[PDB]
C-alpha cells in the first residue's frame, strides 16, 4: 500500500471527575428519617433542615414547640441483677 495523512495536537487535560446525577440533597434532622430532597425545608423555629414528610413543625418534634415528650426517662432500681447464691 501507499497512503499518508497530516494533522495532530498535544493535549494535557485532567482524568474527568464522576459526573453525578443529583445536584445538592439535603438530609432530614428527624429522629428516625432517613430521606432527602432536592431543596432544603428549614424551619424557622428549630433552624433545621427536614423532609417535605417532616416540613411541619410537631411533625418533626420541633424543639422549640411548647412540648415536651409524653415519656421520662427510665428511673427504676433494676431487678432480678446481681450475683445469686445458692
Ligand atoms: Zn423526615
Ligand atoms: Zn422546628
Do not use: W
Not at 464522576?18 to 428549614?42: M, N, Q, R, W
Amino acid at each position: 500500500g501507499s497512503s499518508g495523512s497530516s494533522g495532530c495536537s498535544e493535549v494535557n487535560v485532567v482524568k474527568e471527575r464522576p459526573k453525578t446525577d443529583e445536584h445538592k440533597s439535603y438530609s432530614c434532622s428527624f429522629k428516625g428519617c432517613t430521606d432527602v430532597e432536592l431543596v432544603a425545608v428549614i424551619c424557622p423555629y428549630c433552624e433545621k433542615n427536614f423532609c417535605l414528610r417532616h416540613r411541619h413543625q410537631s411533625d418533626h418534634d420541633c424543639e422549640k414547640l411548647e412540648v415536651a415528650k409524653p415519656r421520662m426517662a427510665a428511673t427504676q432500681k433494676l431487678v432480678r441483677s446481681g450475683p445469686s447464691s445458692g
